[PDB]
């Protein structure tokens, strides 16, 4: 039944990680971010209300699909000014299907390490051309009608199917940051980065 608590845990995590990525990749100016501590790590978090709302609407809508485990990967895509994908932060997900105490805090211990990898990830990636936008993509496991239904959870925040233009990146080179395993969660974060 744990479907919902892992979804809980992951959503709290992806919010942290998304914010940090927008900061570290400089998709938004230093100045709307405020220093915070999460999983006991120094992080940044926008306090621009609409950006925050945006990121939240997204995670709120994904949540139920995590609960039933239909999401295969969640990907944050940085786009150049021509709307061509420059790089993607790929969170590949598994939820293996029971429990003896403090499992959750061990899981957050492991996620902390992802947050760090993100915060020192300029060391391994080439910087983007300026005027980059970003977007979120949710790759479902199954191509399923049911998926569209459970994702349409806020009117005023619809989802559509992606185009080839949203996903095609020519010649990707791969930069893994972090992998983890546990009884409840298996996840890896790698970056797919455009070649030139």
């Amino acid at each position: 039944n744990f479907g919902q608590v892992v979804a809980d845990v992951l959503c709290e995590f992806l919010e942290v990680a998304v914010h940090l990525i927008l900061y570290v990749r400089e998709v938004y100016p230093v100045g709307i971010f405020q220093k915070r501590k999460k999983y006991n790590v120094p992080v940044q978090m926008s306090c621009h209300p609409e950006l925050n709302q945006y990121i939240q609407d997204t995670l709120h809508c994904v949540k139920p699909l995590l609960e039933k485990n239909d999401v295969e990967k969640v990907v944050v895509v940085i786009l150049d000014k021509e709307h061509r994908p420059v790089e993607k932060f790929v969170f590949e997900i598994t939820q293996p299907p029971i429990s003896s105490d403090s499992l959750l805090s061990h899981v957050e211990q492991l996620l902390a390490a992802f947050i760090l990898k993100i915060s020192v990830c300029d060391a391994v990636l080439d910087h983007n051309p300026p005027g980059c936008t970003f977007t979120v993509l949710v790759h479902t496991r199954e191509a399923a009608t049911r998926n569209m239904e459970k994702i349409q959870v806020i009117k005023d925040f619809p989802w559509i199917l992606a185009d080839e233009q949203d996903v095609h990146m020519h010649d990707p080179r791969l930069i893994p940051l972090k992998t983890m395993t546990s009884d409840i969660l298996k996840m890896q974060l790698y970056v797919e980065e455009r070649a030139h």
Partner: peptide, 21 residues
Amino acid sequence: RTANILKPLMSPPSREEIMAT
């Protein structure tokens, strides 16, 4: 290439609308 990829219709706020502070 298939359609198991979902996307929000709405765009995140532009760099400009932020600098609107």
